[model samples]
Target: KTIKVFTTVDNTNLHTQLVDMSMTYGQQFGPTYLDGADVTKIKPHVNHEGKTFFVLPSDDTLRSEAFEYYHTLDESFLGRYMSALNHTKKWKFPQVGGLTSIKWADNNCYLSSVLLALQQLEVKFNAPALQEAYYRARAGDAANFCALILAYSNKTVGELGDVRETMTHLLQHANLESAKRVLNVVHCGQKTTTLTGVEAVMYMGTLSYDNLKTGVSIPCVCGRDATQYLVQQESSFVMMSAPPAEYKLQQGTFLCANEYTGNYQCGHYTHITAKETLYRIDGAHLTKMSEYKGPVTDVFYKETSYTT
Candidate 1:
């Protein structure tokens, strides 16, 4: 029996809307800022896991720190500081209070906001290195960072054709690493499966929905010869698949998928199961399908908002 996977149009539309809303909100709010004078007055609390440690301040303190950092900026310093903040993960600030609120308003809002800020700085400062760093840090891949920065910067500040050329180059490469990083940061509970014998793992792309019970599927990197399944652990969801059923030993490979609340939509890996598949019994169906192949990796997603 062929297991058919389905994703409903309503589900796909909802997800798209959610993503669009997030992009819009980020554009409207600008970047999150703290009150300039409050920076020095705030203190941080430390959270430790094994030997590694994280320092977290209250929402108020975080806002103060962001403002304080922003206030000390002269033109040169502002350029350098913003550039540094964009590149160094250590210097990155959490979305606190209002920032969090804005992020929560949409699916990929926070990352979009950061990316927009980086774009502005790239133009304002004319610093290629800083621009490259921003793209690298956010995208998790540096191969086309220089090109993307140049393209975006030129479009914003330089002549028209240069920007168009840059965009064309960006389209040709179509970096997925950056998109993966955005998913990893936005999704709160994300998990990966145990590796199967397959040599690679791929991240398909993003899906947004107004409701948590939407269904989605990502193509496998091992091509069509892989057996796949979904494993739910706590708040996380993972995709696991192995070599084709014709293979002798079935060692399953794992990848992360966006979490869902009510039901999940599953589709056949195509390489292994020629028929489309669905995990949940509901009537949900796959609205779109795309294939992405790369080395094995993990990504994350988190809920930013709840509306009635």
Candidate 2:
């Protein structure tokens, strides 16, 4: 198969800035790595409906729309109100106007930042560029160019305006995953785990032998805290392909027919299991205090306390 390279003036820059900010934000919330170092260097592909799509980034409609939405956001009452508080320190409110060390949250920017990233992804998928990519990917195949028009019929079905949102329903009708995966290659990168509560503090600083032995206390992500308590959660998910689809006349519905019907099955179903344990580190030793379930997503938001 042949390959394609593409670009979009607004989306490219927009994605780049979002990645930079997300990485910086990850330090406080959780660990995030750049899947693609340079947006321009990678080919953007959307994987959906058991097929991969290679789209050139040539659309800017969503880019402009997002800008308008984002701009209106910053002009709201909350935006101006937060700005006032950020600049307020002169009334002897514990510090001078320009001398305080606290980081006042930029209410508008902080809230809009994450939403923008998600918006951009949806825009990329809806663009005419994606249609061309799909056509190019399958040469001489029976092309359903009419599916493009079918995308718009759902606008009346939902309240959103973006073509991306409409395309989402089309994806559902086509028996595809709700969230499509966008693929790209990054040459150089670094990754970190999300740490929180006492773990975050310790990870940022360090746990000396004396500190560990004495058992310093702090809050945990579980909505509670115990002296030197840490949590390790492991979840397992197996990958399995979708079986062939079949139409059932009795039920009058299309269904995926497969042999994996029992509990914990994997032909059409996959069962996820988790292992969780609570530990306490004190006196230079680690102790398991409890065991329970972890996040169902099977991805760890925090680093494991037990490490090599």
Candidate 3:
């Protein structure tokens, strides 16, 4: 006959082993063992049974109260619009091109309207940083004004990540979109700046259309076809650009002022229904694309009728 003896392991020993196993795997991903053990500090205690055991504390201590936040202004739709404003030559019209020769070309309807909105924000908040932008805007310095807006946007996003909401509040407070017309060309210190007037209106209209799915048919000076006026998606497409924030056009389709003004056909039409086709028209080539539909809106064209 053979005698067999079965030894039992302590549950505490098994628990410590399990914890060690978990920590060993967990350490690979993050700091699993925050409380390090010191061979000199930890003393082994001997029990009455002549067995030694090491005491380890339970892993239940608070680690930290700090967390991380990421601001994604560069990836936002508002970011795209801000970028569109950065291009100087595109918005600062009246040097060349048939569209530039028209009464529309001599005015800065879009630029002035945008800066006016910023100016209103400056007035409401009275921010010193933005105050400088107002002065620059008065001087017709679109580039610096845009740079300030870009920097302020970063600061705002750093504190509060929601930029579109801030834009909505500012625009609503200014009420630029609802106005019959905004500020026109500013020619002070021999520098000229103007608004295309409808820039803010188009954007606000697109914003409402996109959110509520409103099928409102806003027509252009050109004939009102589905593809003849700007669409909500095309509005985004025109302004959207990848960031690192430079003032030049990099890559993307754009709706530019028409090369020929024989009729009232404006760039807004092709933008309403733009295609992949590109344009090489002189002077206004930077605006990018112009889809020519024969003139029919001559009666609609007026010196005082292009308001949003």
Q: Pick the candidate with the highest lDDT.
A: 3
Which residue runs of candidate 2 sit more than 4 Å off their true CA positions?
1-56, 64-203, 207-308
Lowest summed lDDT window (length 10), candidate 1 = 47-56
Better of 2 and 3 by lDDT: 3
**How well does candidate 1 match the true structure in TM-score terms?**
0.17
TM-score of 3: 0.21
lDDT of each: 0.24, 0.22, 0.27
- Best by the TM-score measure: 3
Report the lDDT tens digits of candidate 2 across residue range 1-308: 22222211222221222122222323322221111111223232332112111222234354463334222221121222221222221111111111111122212111111121111122223334335523432331111221222222221111222222233333332222222211111113422244322222222111122232244344442444444422221211111122212211111110101111222321121111112333212111233423322211111111112321
TM-score of each: 0.17, 0.15, 0.21
| Better candidate number, 1 or 3, judged by TM-score | 3
Error of 1 at 73 (Å): 4.6
Please provide, for model 1 over 1-308, each residue's C-alpha lDDT reduced to its tens digit, 9 standing for 90 to 100.
Answer: 11111211221221111112223222422221111111112221122011111112224344343434332222222222322222222222332211111111112221222232222121222334344554453444321333233333322111122211232323322222221111111123343443221111122332212111233333343332222232212222222222212221111221122111221222221111111221111111222223323221112223222212
lDDT of 3 by residue, 1-308 (tens): 11121111221232222222222322322211111111112222222122222222323321121110111222222222232233332344222222221112322222322342232121332334344545655555444444334333432211212223234333332324332323221112221223332343333222222221323343432444222122222111121111111111111322322111222222221111122443322323323333433311100001213322
